[PDB]
Symmetry: D2
């Protein structure tokens, strides 16, 4: 944590968790986009691994691999509707552009 | 640091710094690629700002904004030649894909 | 996590948790010793706060305030017997002396 | 950096550096106080090692071992006079007591 969710993102995640009928909560992750690039990833979690770090915002369990925490700290997960596009959006004060 | 450069990257950076004729060294940075994405950035530096953190690998000064250090720690800057493509490549043990 | 417990520490903590009859697990914390000093602190936890980060080693829930994580990462909690003294001991590879 | 010096601390350090007649600046470090304890350390630096991270506040070069940066980030070095006592004092918002 110092990872936060906006109302709409928590709502969206809770919506997903409710329709599914099970699950511990939300996984934030990170992967290479290619060569000089990082991509954020979202997944459902049923079970935290022993490698995982677990925390809470707006009553949503967020699971983050311990090794990925350096990249994700300070992240605000938002859910936005822009034009014909609707989906999750990651923000950092520390980062820019 | 715990940011490292490979021989070829240091060489490449030193090559760039030599042909240019001036410069303090190398800036590692980070920017949003879009929505759920981070892009690594490389720039020349003539002057560290007071916000900057400075360190050394293979006698190359690396300058990193203090706020970007969470994302870049553990980074190995390499320089690779693959097919018709030649350029810088960022690696992290912590990250994957 | 990247916070670990030795066998004896986990045993000791589980022993404590068993005799007590309840509790979520273990809190690792940090406080000022005075002027130029930090002291590690151990406490029982019944409830993770929303500020807390939770993780696992040897089936012991470790709770760490999100703000204290910078100081505690890489910590090995051990439990040692030395002479007439027996108690918890904190180690870091990164740190020395 | 995100390590800062107060006016009095920078003054004090610069005073020390001036009377000495040489030196690159200031080393912030960390050592074990004993068992469950950390102590902050201050030293002069003439030469940053390749392991070191260098930054600036109030035109004072602060040198911090890369491995010690997790413990020192967010530190405010102050210099205070309290009673018959006068000396350096380390603060963190993140930490308490």
């Amino acid at each position: 944590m110092s990872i936060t969710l906006s109302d709409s993102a928590a709502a969206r995640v809770n919506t997903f968790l409710a329709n599914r009928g099970k699950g511990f909560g939300l996984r934030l992750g990170v992967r290479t986009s290619g060569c000089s690039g990082m991509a954020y990833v979202l997944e459902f979690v049923d079970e935290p691994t022993p490698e995982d770090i677990v925390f809470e915002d707006k009553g949503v369990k967020v699971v983050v691999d311990g090794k990925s925490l350096q990249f994700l700290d300070g992240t605000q997960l938002d859910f936005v509707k822009e034009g014909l596009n609707e989906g999750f959006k990651f923000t950092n004060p520390n980062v820019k552009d």
